[PDB]
Each structure stands twice: as C-alpha cells, then as structure tokens.
Amino acid sequence: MDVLYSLSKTLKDARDKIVEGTLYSNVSDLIQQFNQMIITMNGNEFQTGGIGNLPIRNWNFNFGLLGTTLLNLDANYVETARNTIDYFVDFVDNVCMDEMVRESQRNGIAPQSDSLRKLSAIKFKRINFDNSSEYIENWNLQNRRQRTGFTFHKPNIFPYSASFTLNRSQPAHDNLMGTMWLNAGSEIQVAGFDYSCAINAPANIQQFEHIVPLRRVLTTATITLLPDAERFSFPRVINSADGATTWFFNPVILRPNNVEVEFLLNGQIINTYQARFGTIVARNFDTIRLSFQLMRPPNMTPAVAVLFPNAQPFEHHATVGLTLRIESAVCESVLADASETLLANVTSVRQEYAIPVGPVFPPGMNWTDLITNYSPSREDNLQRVFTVASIRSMLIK
Amino acid sequence: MDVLYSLSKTLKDARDKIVEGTLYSNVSDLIQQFNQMIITMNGNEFQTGGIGNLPIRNWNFNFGLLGTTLLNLDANYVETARNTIDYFVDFVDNVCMDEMVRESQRNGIAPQSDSLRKLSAIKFKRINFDNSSEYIENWNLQNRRQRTGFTFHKPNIFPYSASFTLNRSQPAHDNLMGTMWLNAGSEIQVAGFDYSCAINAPANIQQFEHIVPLRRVLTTATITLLPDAERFSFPRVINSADGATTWFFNPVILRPNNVEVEFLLNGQIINTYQARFGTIVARNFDTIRLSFQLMRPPNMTPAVAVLFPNAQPFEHHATVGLTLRIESAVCESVLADASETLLANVTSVRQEYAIPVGPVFPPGMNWTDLITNYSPSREDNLQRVFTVASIRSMLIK
Amino acid sequence: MDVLYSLSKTLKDARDKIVEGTLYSNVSDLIQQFNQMIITMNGNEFQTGGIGNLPIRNWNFNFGLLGTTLLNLDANYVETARNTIDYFVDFVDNVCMDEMVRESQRNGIAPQSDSLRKLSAIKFKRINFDNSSEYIENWNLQNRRQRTGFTFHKPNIFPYSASFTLNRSQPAHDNLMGTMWLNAGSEIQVAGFDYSCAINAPANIQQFEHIVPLRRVLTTATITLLPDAERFSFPRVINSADGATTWFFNPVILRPNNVEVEFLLNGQIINTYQARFGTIVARNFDTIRLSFQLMRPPNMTPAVAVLFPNAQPFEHHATVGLTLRIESAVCESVLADASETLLANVTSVRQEYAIPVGPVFPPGMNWTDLITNYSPSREDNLQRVFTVASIRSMLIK
Amino acid sequence: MDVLYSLSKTLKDARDKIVEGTLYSNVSDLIQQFNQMIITMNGNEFQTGGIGNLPIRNWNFNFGLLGTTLLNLDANYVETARNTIDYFVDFVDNVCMDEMVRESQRNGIAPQSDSLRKLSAIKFKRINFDNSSEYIENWNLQNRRQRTGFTFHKPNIFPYSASFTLNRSQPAHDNLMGTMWLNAGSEIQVAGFDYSCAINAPANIQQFEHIVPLRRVLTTATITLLPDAERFSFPRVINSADGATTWFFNPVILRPNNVEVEFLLNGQIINTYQARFGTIVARNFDTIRLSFQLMRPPNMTPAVAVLFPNAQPFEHHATVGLTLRIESAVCESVLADASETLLANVTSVRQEYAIPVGPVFPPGMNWTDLITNYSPSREDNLQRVFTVASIRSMLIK
Amino acid sequence: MDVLYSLSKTLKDARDKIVEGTLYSNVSDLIQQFNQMIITMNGNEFQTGGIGNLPIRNWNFNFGLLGTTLLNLDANYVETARNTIDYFVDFVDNVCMDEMVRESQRNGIAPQSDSLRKLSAIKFKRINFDNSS
Amino acid sequence: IAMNMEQIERASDKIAQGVIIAYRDMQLERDEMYGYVNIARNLDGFQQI
Ligand SMILES: [Zn+2]
C-alpha cells in the first residue's frame, strides 16, 4: 500500500516535473527515485483483474534507465519518459481497480489482490517515497495505532431516516402529538407538533425531545443550528405507522421555546447550548440531543385566537421545528461527504465491471445501509478501498 | 502559457522558500531556476494592456543574478530577492490581466495578448518549471489530447430555468395538471401537481416525468436525492404561459410514489434508481430523467377525505416533489462551482476596467447565458481564461 | 511565529519524507534542515501551559544529530527519527495549545505565551524554512503591510439576526406591511409582505428595501441570488416588537417585481443587478442593498380574486421574498466558513481546558458576538490564534 | 512501556535468581542485563506523582555496578543487590502509580506521566529485555497492528441490567406476558412468563425471545447453558415500568420447549443450538439470541389442572427460564474477569490517593458504566492502565 | 509432537526475547537454537490441509541464518527476525490446524497429519527444546 | 557511476557474479555467444547466499 502510493506519487511528479526545457536541478532528485523504481520493478511479472468483467492483464517490466546527463531536458528525454510513465500509469490504474473491487470479512486491512500482495514484499520496499496525502498519512498512523483525523466538509454521518413518532394518537387522527424528523447527509430537520397547542398541557407547555445517536465519534464540528425546520412546515398527508390509513397535517409555526442542544459522549454532556442559534461548535460527541418545547402564546390577537379553539376541531396545528447542519467535522473513521469523490470512484469501479455482491459491502454499495450497520470489518474494508481510490484519483483524473 | 505558470510558480516558491535565516540547501534548487529565469528574461521588453481602461505598461528587465554563496540566507539576500520578485509579480499580474480580458472566435486556445504571444517562443522555454496545479495539468493533457477531469464541488451545470408545464389546463385554471421545476446551480427541484388528485386517472395514478439535458458529460457524481421539493410546497399565485392572467396554487404534499431516477448517456440507461433516496451515485451521464407518480391514497381518515372531493371545487391541490442536488462531480470541460473563485476573478477583471462586449462571451459575463449556449469555441476561451485566472490567483491573493 | 510554522513544516515533512526504504537523495535537503533544527534547539529549556487546566510542562532538548551516510534509509534511522519527531511534535502541540489560549487587548499580534516569546529571538531564526501555507503567507505579507486575501467557501460574515420590521402596523395586527429577514452564515433570506397587496398603494406597487452592512470588505464574491425566500413562505405566529402579543402571518407568494441588488462600497454603487437571478458576482463591496417591490397583479383568475378583497379581512397575505447566498469570497481579514475547522480547533482547546473569559474574546467564543462587534484588536487576536490553529492542524490531525 | 516492563522483569528475576549461595552460571546472563540497566539509568533524574494526594518524589540514580567475579554468590553480593533492587523497585512502583492514575481523551495509548514519557527515548532502549507476559505480548502485537487475544475466566462482558418487558399488560396486572432478565458479569438469566399459560395463544404455544448485544467480539467461548433460571422462579412483587405501582409474580416452572440459542456476528448466524444443554461452544460472536417458547401441557394430572383455569384468576403463573454462563472466552479487547485482579489494582490506586474524576473514565471507576459505553478511546486508556497494573502486580504483590 | 512444541516455544521466545535494543547476552542462547532450527528446516517441503474447507498450503523453507555479532540488537536484526518468525508462525499455525482436525480409531496417540508425520523423524530431532508447559 | 555499476561489472569477462548449484541435470543453454554454455539468466527459485 505504501509502495503503491509511492509509485503513484512518482508518476504524478514525473508527469509534473519532467517537462520540456526544464532545468536538470529541478528534477535531479526525482530521476534518481524513478531510476530506483525502474531498477526495482524490472524482472517482475504481475497479473491484474479476474473478477466480474475486469479483464485479466499480464504486466512485464523491461525498461532502460533514464539519462542523468542533460542540463535542460530536451524533447527526446521527455518522450521516452512519457512512454515509461504511460506504461506504469496503466499498470497502477489496473492494480488500483483490482484492489478497490475486492474485500474480505476476515482481515480487510490486508491487501487482497495478487499484485498488491506481491508489492508488499521488502524487495519492493525501496520504491517507497514521501507519504504526504491525507489518506496515506492516516494509513501510516493507524498502521502504528496512533490518533488520526479525516477532515470532512458536510459528512454523510446520518443514514437516511425520514419517519415520525406519535406520542398522542387515535384512529380519528384529529388530535395528535409528537415529533417528525429528517436525518439526511449532514442535516437533521426535526419538528414536534401538537394539535391542541398545549391547551390541556401543564403550564401550557409541551416538551419535545429528539435523540440522534451517531455511528462514529465526531470531533471539532462546526454546526449551523437554525430554528423553524422548513420541510415540516407545509400541509401534507402522511401514511400511518402500519401503513393502513393516511392523516392530514396542516401546520402553523411557532418559534421554538427553550431550545437545549446537548452533545453527548458516552452519556456525558460535553457541550450544551441553551437558546443559542447561528453557528455553534461541538468539540467531541457521538450523540445529539435536541430538547425544544412548544409554549402556547398567552397573548393572541384576534387573527391568532381563531386558530386555536378550546374545543376539538383543529384546522391549524401547532408545529415547532429545528434544523441542525454539520458543516465540517473531523472524524477518526472514514466517511463520505460533499467534498471528496472517493465513494463515487469506488462505486463507479464496482458498477462499471458488473461485480457480484460480496460478504462485506451492501448490494449496490448502498451508503445508507453501509452507515446504518457500520461494523469495524466494514470500516477496515472501507478505509482500505478509499485509500486505494485516493491513489487512483491522484493518477487517473 | 506553460512559461507563465512557470514564472508564477517560481515567484510563489521564491516568496515562500527564500526567507530570512533559512538554510541554503532548502533553496539550492530554486535559486538556480530563478537565475535561469533572470538570464532568460533579460534584454526583452514587453507591453501589457491597451483594451478598455486597462493601462498600457512597458516592461524592461535588467536584473543581476542572485548570490549562490550563503549558508544561511541573511536579510540582504532577502531584500534584493523581494525587490526582483515584486517587479516580476507586477509583470505577471499585468500579463494575466491582459490575457483574461481578451478572446477570439477563431482559435480561443491560442494566446491573445502580445506579451503571452511573445512568451510562447522557444527562447523563453527554459523558464519552464513543474506543472503541478490542476488547471495547468489539464492544460498540458488537453494539449496532447488525453482525457482530463476537473473535480467540482456543487458545479454550476444547470442554467437558471424556473418555469412550469400544464399537461391539463383551461382558462378557468381550477383543474390543472403538470410539472413545475427549478433548475439552479447544482440543484433540481421538481414538483408534479394534480388538482383532482387522480380521481379520474386510470388506477388513481398520474404519471409525471421531467427530463433535464446537460451541456457537458458529468462523470462520477455524488448526488443527494431527497423527496418533497420544498420550494413548490407553499401556496403561490403564478402568471400564465402567455403572461396574461394569474392562477392560484394551494398545495398539499403527498409522498412520491414509484420514483425512478435514470442517468442517460446518449439515450442509454447508465444508472437507474427505483425508490431509493439519500446519497446516490451516477458514474457517467449527460441527461437526468426523473419519473415520479402521484397515487391517490385509497384509505383516508376524515381529516383527509374532506380535502379531495369527487366534484369540481378543489381548494387543496395534490403536489408531489423531488430534489436532486449534485454535491460533487468530475467534468472534462471547465465549469463554475461553489469552491473555486476563478469565474469571480474573470468577471472582476472584466468589470473593473470597463471592457466592451466581444464576440464570444455574453454581455456582463452572464453565466446563465454562457452555460445555456456552451459552444466549443466558448469552451476553449473559458478554459484558457480560467487557466490564466488560476495562475493569477496563485500570485495575486 | 515563523519559526513555529517552520518547526511544524519540518516535522510534517519528516513524518512524510523520512520513511523506510526511501532513497537518500529524496531526503537529502530535509535532513540538513532537521539537523539545523536539532543544533539550534539543543541547550534550551521551555515551559508550556499554566492557564486554566492546561498543565505546566517543562521541555528540555538533548538530542543527537541524524546520520547522513545511508543510500536507502533503513529501519534504524526511521525509528530514531520517529523518536525525535514524536518529542518535537509533543513540544509544538503544547506550544500551540499555550498560544491559542492566550490573548491581549494591547497588541494581540505579538506572541503571548512564554515559549513563543522565547522562540521569537534571532538565535532560533535559523530554524526557519519555507512559508507555503495560506495563513503563514498572509501572516508574512501583513507583517510587511501588503494586501492579503483569505479565500473562504461560504464565509460566516453575517451575524445571526432573525427579526422583522413593520412599516405599517396597529394593535389589531390585521393590516400589516414591512420586511422580515434571516441573516445567517452566508445566507440572507428576506421577505417583504403587505396584507392589502397594494390595494391602496400608488400604481398598486409597494416598494421594499433591505440594507445589510458588512463588517469586513468582501472581494470577488460569487453569490447565488434566487427569488422566493423559502423560510418566510409558510404560516406562522410571531411575537410583537415589545414581546407583548403575537400576530399571525398567512403568506401567499408573488414573484418579486423589479429586483435591484446593489453592492455598495463606501456608499458608491460598485455592482448592480436588475432582475437577474442565478449566479451573480460582486467584485468589491461591504454593503448589500436589496430593493424588490410587490406589484398587485392586474389580471386575476377567479381562484385568485377571492384571495385579495378590497375590504379589511385578509386571510391570505401577499409576501415577496429573495435569497442571497455567498458561495465563496476573498476577504482580507480572517473569518470562519464551512470549509476550514480552525474556529472549531480554537473553541475545542478553549473548552477542553476550562479557560476563563478574558478581555477580548466573547464568553464561550460566541462567533455571533465576535462578528457583531469585530474590533481590530479582536481581529488581530483572531488572526494570530487562527494562524497557530492552522499550524497545530498541520501537525495534530 | 517496553522499558518499564523490562525494568520490572529484571527486578523480579534479580529478586528470584540472585540469592545467597547460588552458582554464578545460573545468574551470569542476568547480571549483565542488570549492569546494562545501571549503566543506562545513571545520571538521569525523574519526578513521579503530583496529582491528587500522590506525593511528588524525585529520583536520582547513582549506583555502582555489580561484581562479576564470584563462583557462588556470597551474602555481601546479595545485600548490595538487595539495596539496589529495593531502590529500583520503589522507583518503578511510583512510576506505575503515576501512570495508572492519568488518562487522556486525545491519544490514550501514549504515556501520560513525565517519567514514562522520559523512559520512551532510545537512550533507555538498551534497558529492554524479554516481553513474555500476556499483557506486554498483546501490547507489542497491537503496537504493530496484529491480532491479539486475552484469555478470560468468566469475563465481565455484560453490564448489570436487571429489568423486564411486558408484551401483554394492563393496569390490573393480573394477565401479563413477557420476559424478565438478569445480565450480570458473565451470566444471563432470562425467564419468559405468561399468566394464561398460552390458553388463547395459537397452538397453545407462546414464543419468547431475548437478544443480548455485546460490546466486544468474543472468540472461542465455552458456555454453560442450563434451563430453569433460578432467580426468576420464586414469588416476588415488582415495581411497574413508570415505578408507580407494584405487581405480583407467583411462578410455576415449565421446562423450556424448543430452545434455540444463536450466536450472531454482524447479523450472521455463526453457531446455533437447538434443544441442547450442558456445555456448548461459541467460536465467534458479538450477539446472543435466546429463542425459547412456552407450550401448554396437553395432558395434565388433577394436581396440575387446578393451576391453570380457562377463566381470569390465575394464582399460579407459567414461567420458563434459561441460564447462560460464559465460563471462559478469548477477547481481543481488555476486560475484567474473576481471575485477574488488575481492575482491583487500578481502582485501589485511584481510590487510595483521592483522585479527581477525569475526562475518560467513569466517576469511581464504575465498571458497569465503563462497559455500558465502551468507546475506543476508553478502550485504549483501559488497556494502557491494565498493562501498567500488570507490571506493578509483577513487582508489588 | 515434541518438535512441534519446540518450534512453538522458540517462536514464542523469539517474539519475546528478540526485541529492539536488548543486550545480546540475554538472547545468546536463543539465537543458537533458532539457527539450529533454520539449519534443520531448510531443504524440506511440507503440505498442510486438505480436509473440509481447510485449504492445501505448500511450505518451502529457504532462509538465511541470523547474525551473532551484535552487542545490542538493532532494528535491522529485529525486522529480519520478524520476517522469519512470521513465516514459521504461519507454518506451525497451519500444522496445528491440520493436526487438531484429524483423528483415528486405531491408534489416536500417533500423529495423523502428513506434516507432523514428517516432523516425527530424527532428522528433525535437533529442533527439540525445553518441554515446560 | 552508481547506476552504471551493474553494466560495467556485468560486461567484464574476467569475473562472473555467482554460481547456481542445482544438483539436478539442468540442460546446457544454447547461446550465439558461446555455443552451448551453462549460463544463467536469473538467480530465481534458489537461495542467494
Ligand atoms: Zn461546500
């Protein structure tokens, strides 16, 4: 894995640094590493592919070394360099597509393809170069069991869970009470509704609560906390819990009284925020507890007093919402987010070559089913395949 | 173009690496490239500007070489380096503002300013240095006709198109049927509505369909697909097709039954998704086909059954929506997105100096009119001017 | 500060470049800088911490130099390098946590901890290395008073201000007129409403206006301007100005007639946009003026004409909105945004060690109260602590 | 950590092997290691303690080497050896009590005390000796990320959870149905009860089910599975779910019909056992699913037929139980069990010196709250402190 | 059986005693036994597995001896020792899983796998070490 | 000089860089240089001492 990143880093630098007319002192330390790579890789044969429609390709390396005698690199040196680089780039492309496609339940952090099991010897250890990308740094730090952090912009930590809860209900569905939520991507939109608007609740206050457990512990998260959840604020008809009948929801929106957002780690309150909106911070957490309440307004104009009678027919239903959007967060495990394209590369390789469903990953690489049951073996497989996807995304655009 | 990136890369590195007190071996390979640059650029005169209010500046280069005899760089060397660097940074700033401002219908990929046409000789080819940024890498790969990819975070692939379609309509506008949509940035929000709620449709099911053709082929796109389009879910009054009269839209929201999202490339179904929300992936596509349908709920509580009569007056109109947000995508052509500021730099240079409207770009650099008719000559001009904007964004902050 | 970035850059590179089996010419210029660092840091003692619960640690440096005699780096050299690197990484971690925690009203741009005041001597000046990150580049450019620019993706330039304004009001609250707004993060959502729908306004047109002053001058901003503000488009009950009574708001949405978005710098109109939506650009501005107006539709179908009578009871209230979202912008001062995690690191260090509220920063590091009153001393403290946070984010993941 | 185990292993062996009258060839390889230890530790000063009531002690090492010239060790050599050994044993005792008392949320696997951070240098690496104990072997194997296994006799994998579940209930509490359980230590005692004895269930069979998720994956577990849970087989009065009222439970015991014990790993059935009691084996599992059912006996003597009427008053309630006791198991993570005393040593050191509650461990070292939320940072801290406790338990009895 | 315990005892001790920085006199009697083990096991090939889903693995031993010339063991010696130890540990793991899986009604106390029947010769008798468990 | 150590050493004709001893009758290799000759291409499969 280290030598695969090293091959790709030298091929990236040798497409970048070895150009026409450049001075030799700019590339004097890269040509020695590329010659060490050629010297190491000669005499060895590899075999990539063999699963799904990924074709079996045989790789044989017989190349001459590059010259170390120019002052300015002329176009002859650039053309022979482009030939050797294009062959090695095709090789590492097929090794990365052979490694992202395989998985194992037993020990997923180990290389699974034959080519990367062959590259994991000490004969190939002199290929090794700097490990400067974030994924290979976290690979090398977790290979020695130290703390890592992946910085994500809007991480997909929440599985898709659009549902509700009726704390007070009946088959008439004309006096309901409870919460509704949308957990999607990095965004929680929650809305507790009461049809009576707390006309018989004690002190005209109805307490709502919504507890979201996470799968991995997020660290140093900037979170936009806004009131008035926008999706649960227009009238809609909703199927029941058993899916038998449908019930109508005509909301009018009160502001959330007494918002308490708590960030729990192992049941301990790490951060708490009482009636503070805008951008908040949560330093260390794996559970988000939103505690908002609906208070009936004690003074109402005649336009408002016709909405909430004391009797039964409520044509306008009180609804109170919050929105919580994790903008950026540092997570020790791998995830998906709106910035990288690594999950897209993994799914593109697994869908392009018509790959059968294996023992670990969900069918079709369903990220909702992958983050719903995010086991440590699946975590190891996901980190390995994302690291190889980062390597191929360095070489192949 | 390669030598302009090389000038800017050396000036960036020589502002970074040549500091006070640093060891000479850290900068021993940069001072040789900077001396090669001084040796190449001496004796040459340039002329920048001359269009709009961009002033004509004459550039003459007569500089001495930098010393190669220190062990730790003292402040004398830093001050003479800062002088030479500030003159070259002002030169390359005015060359980049002279190149981003010009365009040509005939061959836009060629340099248009006099200074960059003079820098495109082989006398200046020994200036050349590493080409490591993404835009100069894709410039050098498309100069040899190989595959490229620009990675965008929320790309502006959709032109602004807020409109609707009435599949069933009359001048009374009390029983309507059809779709509404908002295509903006990277976000499609579509909503098909029926006023009758499929009370006379066969099997109480009304089929909607919305086909969005793209202008360039996106590759490996992560896409957040949510139901219940939020913008078309509140009551509004809307002008008619001819703009004569206005009609009222009072929606209640059903969930989208039988969602089929297809990603078409040349009419062939590449990816398809049947009733799956959350984050989806689309590996290769240039057309997005959303096929959702409205099904009348067969079991309704008395709060719902009063909304949808069998007769004509529908005060509550059935509406079904979807939301499709491309979070990140790899596109072979240049675009604009929410991450880079290159389009902002191009428009700032073209608006600061009061530049007349030329033959290629839209008046005022309208990105909606630029991506509505995204011709290959306009594509070449846009890629050239974005590459020069990336170069100037390296030097000028 | 320069030498602290230099220590962290060498430790990052020496974790990256000094690996097992790599060629010596790849690391021949890094080992000399790391040996210069060891030679400079020997014989010196430091003391970190001493505020809050940050523990006092004493640092003593007595290390041998690294060998310069290998061709390929074997595992002995890697293990002794990992020992020296782990000690220096722990040292620079505690120096950065000692510097981010302190502040001063008098001159905040100066180092406040004892360790960084000791590192600011010319004895330690030979530690210095390249200054290539954006924050240390802008630190070195503002240390010489030149122009800088921080590129932000969705900058938190707006403090959280959710409020309204009643241009026409009475204690009945049945015929109201005025604007409502949400300024949050990088997003302005504004909506002017009239209950009469301009039935007595001259020419049936009511002019709205919303002026947002900024705290720092943004430059080259890409801005998504959409109509129809989504948050102020559903019915809600709202407390009054004095908080005494509540009033009801049942909106129907007209489109915004005659949108004029102006970008003011020192009262001068820099950019203006008349009825143009989608992505717009604003090259230089510190005030955003939105001027939209509500026009009563002169032709209405019978479904619309029942909404707006000539008499007093208006059960449907005309409402017109806009949405303005700054996607990316270049600002000369430091801010927070959705891309970096530096504010999260600063708040995590200040909340982890239970730090008392000092003279400059708000209690609990409230970013709304920090950008509401964004004084230049607070600007200097914020830039210094963000630079140290960037340094620690390079070393500590 | 390796050198701390090495110090303790040499001090243990030098109390054991260096005795009066023993032959020199028995101790000829130990005296060289002890002299290497003296040579390494001279000239160094240490400082232990400083948290809670643990006193600050300063350690200075100035010792002469031991003689290598005897044939049989006389009492002079034994007395000077006992002096040097007693000083080093007091030193390593205070280093171990300084290390078990500290913890860190950030990276718990790193040494936290100043003395063990000073011992983690390569100057002290020549102290190192054999690593033969189980905890230092698993420390060295997990420092290279290989598979480990701790063998536990009756592991405390279950948190204390004594509760119940009423599948059928009413406020009268005279016809109840559901399960009761005791999860304690390594023992699950579960009992499903029906008051009607399945007199109206289909086919006179009531299905019970009890699913116990584990926190860490146990491997190769010998498990005593017996029927007839003894604790839930005598009459008792039990508070309700809300704690309002109490209900009576008068059990008569049927045998468990159709016992199915399944051992789930990631939802997959690894081992299953159908109506087999005695000692069973479970090779790899992290969830235990007990599926027993109550069948009404179709033939009953007149002494039994008076117990279960068809009508409502049931003075004798049918109850069916199982008992599952993990006798020994191999777990990759650290735990507590009935064999070791390491948790007792950790709690004795933390309670003897009146130590404040830190960020990681529960207050008072509550093992139920520690295994209820067994996070990986808490896992790393627990493994580090248990390894140091094993070292001190080698030296201090 | 005695030589299988001896292989495992030397591999356990050589994971324990052969560490980085330790003195050579602590490991001077273990390296000689491990070199005797390498000298005995070279040139021999083994075949493990072949019953149930236990896969057939072929084992070939071609290793160089460990150095006897250090005063403190440096990390080079530790890494080459860890390579040889990991190969022998995988070998003895598969031999033990090949032996626990087989049985015989006739004389069960005899070795049943092919690898342990091959290790029961006097050519492999010089592998033998202390029998302390 | 360092990368061309192998090309200068392995074109020397005074020295040969090692000997396979196989103890089985591997067949004499045909070469246009030497006729029939027991020249070896790689030191693979065997023990490099
Ligand atoms: Zn973003």
TrEMBL record, chains A, B, C, D:
Renumbered to this chain, region (Interaction with the inner capsid protein VP2) spans 62-73
Provide this UniProt record's keywords sorted from A to Z. Calcium, Capsid protein, Intermediate capsid protein, Metal-binding, Ubl conjugation, Virion, Zinc
Chain positions recorded as Zn(2+) binding sites: H153
Write out the GO biological process terms: fusion of virus membrane with host plasma membrane
* Entry binding sites for Ca(2+): N266, D286
What GO MF annotations does this protein's record show? Answer: host cell surface receptor binding; metal ion binding; structural molecule activity
Q: Does the keyword ATP-binding apply?
A: no
Which family does this protein fall into?
Belongs to the rotavirus VP6 family.
Q: What is this protein called?
A: Intermediate capsid protein VP6
Species for this entry: Rotavirus A
UniProtKB/TrEMBL annotation, chain F:
Q: Where is it located? A: Virion
Q: What the entry says about post-translational processing?
A: Sumoylated with SUMO1 and SUMO2. Sumoylation of viral proteins seems to have a positive role on viral replication.
Question: Which species is the source of this protein?
Answer: Rotavirus A
The name on file for this protein is: Inner capsid protein VP2
Q: Which domain of life is it from?
A: Viruses
Q: How does it assemble?
A: Homodecamer; each decamer is made up of two conformers of VP2, called VP2A and VP2B. Interacts with a VP1-VP3 complex. Interacts with the intermediate capsid protein VP6. Interacts with NSP5. Interacts (via N-terminus) with NSP2.
Name the gene. VP2
Q: Could you say which protein family the record assigns here?
A: Belongs to the rotavirus VP2 family.
What is its biological role?
Answer: Inner capsid protein that self-assembles to form an icosahedral capsid with a T=2 symmetry, which consists of 120 copies of VP2, with channels at each of its five-fold vertices. This capsid constitutes the innermost concentric layer of the viral mature particle. It encapsidates the polymerase VP1, the capping enzyme VP3 and the genomic dsRNA, thereby defining the core.
Domain description: The N-terminus binds RNA. It is necessary for encapsidation of VP1 and VP3. The N-termini of 10 VP2 molecules form a cylindrical hub underneath each 5-fold axis of the inner capsid.
